[PDB]
Amino acid sequence: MRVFPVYAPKLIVKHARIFLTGVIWVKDLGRLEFEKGRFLLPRKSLPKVKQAILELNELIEAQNHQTKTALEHH
């Protein structure tokens, strides 16, 4: 239930490290749900939002990079 009056892509992801499971209300995108780090797609939505979430996950994999294989599944 964390609202964001500002966008700031990297700040969202950086702080999502602690809030990994929940939902945010960014004023630029809207209601964004994410579970254990992975920002989820509510639906198709507008390309603006969809691509943003993709680049957020991109940024996630940039800060993470490792991705420790435990249950990633074949």
How would you describe this protein?
The longest helix is centred in the C-terminal third of the chain and has 18 residues, at 47-64. The chain has two helices and four strands; from the N terminus they run βαβββα. Helix 1 crosses helix 2. By secondary structure, the protein is an alpha+beta fold. It has a four-stranded mixed sheet. Strand 1, helix 1 and strand 2 (22-26) form a beta-alpha-beta unit. The protein has a single domain, classed as so0334 like fold. It comes from Shewanella oneidensis (strain ATCC 700550 / JCM 31522 / CIP 106686 / LMG 19005 / NCIMB 14063 / MR-1). This is DUF1107 domain-containing protein.
Supply the number of structural domains: 1
**Radius of gyration, rounded?**
12 Å
CATH superfamily: so0334 like domain
Question: Shape, please?
Answer: globular
Question: So what's the CATH class?
Answer: Alpha Beta
Helicity, as a percent range: 25-40%
* Spatial arrangement of strands, main beta sheet: 1-2-3-4
